Amino acid sequence: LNNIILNLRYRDNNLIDLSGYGANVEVYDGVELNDKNQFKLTSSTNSEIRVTQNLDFSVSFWIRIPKYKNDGIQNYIHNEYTIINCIKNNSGWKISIRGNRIIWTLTDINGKTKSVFFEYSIREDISDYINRWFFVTITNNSDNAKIYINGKLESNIDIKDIGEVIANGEIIFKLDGDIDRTQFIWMKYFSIFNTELSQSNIKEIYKIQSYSEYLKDFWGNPLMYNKEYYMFNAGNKNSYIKLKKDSSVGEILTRSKYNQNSNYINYRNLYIGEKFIIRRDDIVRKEDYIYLDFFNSNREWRVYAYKDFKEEEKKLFLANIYDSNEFYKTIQIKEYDEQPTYSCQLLFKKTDEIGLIGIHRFYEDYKNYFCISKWYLKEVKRKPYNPNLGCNWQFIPKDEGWIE
Amino acid sequence: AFSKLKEKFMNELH
């Protein structure tokens, strides 16, 4: 898969063509860049990238699209805006977004237009897509233009009506349309191929570009130390952790949802439960030894596991930071899943294995509690790794792309 | 303070 004509990648604090065809790439001052290959497009005049290139072609990239402002839903749903435009003599292609939709458009020499789109729901309790890094691939031959999302075919339309399409036009990365000053788009790994990629090729590219040295947060950004995170359980999506009133255990409650009338939108709240923080660059990696802490009022507390553990599962101990011979404190963060994910696991060790952190039904009538469990130790070795297991967790920081 | 929390933890374990 060297069939790449443009490969925009980070190098020496700049975005450049690493294809070997050496396209001229101009990044303007208003674009934000990091060494993790992310670049942000804002509403500012000088937030653009300009590419001067040197029917059977493909375009791949990742994207993180901000959640709708609850008060401005109508603009969101109506107002379309271009993010990438490649035109010459009024002919070429453009990638545009209209609310919860991403749109691919081809225009021929005679101004003839056909479009294909992907629409993600804005009524889901927990969305895989909203404000989260996901993978987009767009293939084109003589017959069909189709969109693949995270390696899976989603959309497909016939284009045999369309005449000649001049696709060697200058590529402008820029927000264009009826946009709020607040509007932004994150993108990474923008590539053009001179062939229709197969589904097999795209699953392989998705899995390659899914890998990183470091663990990731809920949004698909790198998991950090000394950073405040709400906690998400992949096995119990609609649950969260709350400290039991004036006690030392973590009870599991159901997330609240959107309250206002507007029946265009539904979601569960993410900024609910205790604000956790991971203790020992400030980047969290596989097999790292950590302390899992949280803030109780304005004092930093800790998640401990009781060393007297004859039962298969037991409630975790939430208390002030204090060394006790009765309690395990050292957790090792794990990534058992071989397939793409933002989930990690939490393993208490002494070097034996005591149990994994999860959620379980304890009797008192029954109730759900934040627990260690020996059960998970066997399940994580089974293949394929089950992504809906209770021992799979995700960290949600505050993000300007998600206001609730 | 830690003691008073550990007891409450023991009460929950019951």
Residue numbers in the entry:
A (entry chain AAA): 861 to 914, 924 to 1149, 1158 to 1227, 1232 to 1245, 1252 to 1291
B (entry chain BBB): 39 to 52
Give sentences from the paper.
Botulinum neurotoxins (BoNTs) are bacterial toxins produced predominantly by Clostridium botulinum. The heavy chain contains two domains: the receptor-binding domain (HC) which is responsible for targeting neuronal cells at the presynaptic neuromuscular junction, and the translocation domain (HN) which transfers the LC across the endosomal membrane within the cytosol. BoNT/B, /G, and /DC instead bind to either Synaptotagmin I or II (SytI or SytII). BoNT/B2 from Clostridium botulinum strain 111 was first identified in a case of infant botulism and initial characterization found its toxicity to be approximately 10 times lower than that of BoNT/B1.
Instead, only crystals containing HC/B2 in complex with hSytI were produced in the space group P212121, which diffracted to a resolution of 2.5 Å. Electron density can be seen for residues 46 to 59 of hSytI but not for residues either side, indicating some flexibility. There are four residue differences between BoNT/B1 and BoNT/B2 which are in close proximity to the bound Syt peptide: P1117S, P1197N, E1191K, S1199Y. The change from two hydrophobic proline residues to two polar residues (Ser and Asn) is likely to result in a significant change in binding affinity as both of these residues are found neighboring the conserved and central Phe residues of Syt, known to be key elements of the hydrophobic binding mechanism. In BoNT/B2, this loss of hydrophobic interaction is replaced by electrostatic contacts between S1117 and N1197 and the peptide backbone of hSytI. Conversely, the change from S1199 in BoNT/B1 to Y1199 in BoNT/B2 would be expected to provide increased affinity for the peptide via aromatic interactions with F47. In BoNT/B2 however, substitution of a negative (Glu) to a positive (Lys) side chain at position 1191 likely decreases the affinity of B2 for its receptor. Although the backbone of the hSytI peptide occupies a position similar to the one when bound to B1, we identified several amino acid substitutions that cause a loss of hydrophobic interactions between B2 and Syt, thus affecting the overall affinity for the receptor. In B2, the presence of Y1199 is not enough to compensate for the loss of affinity resulting from substitutions P1117S, P1197N, and E1191K.
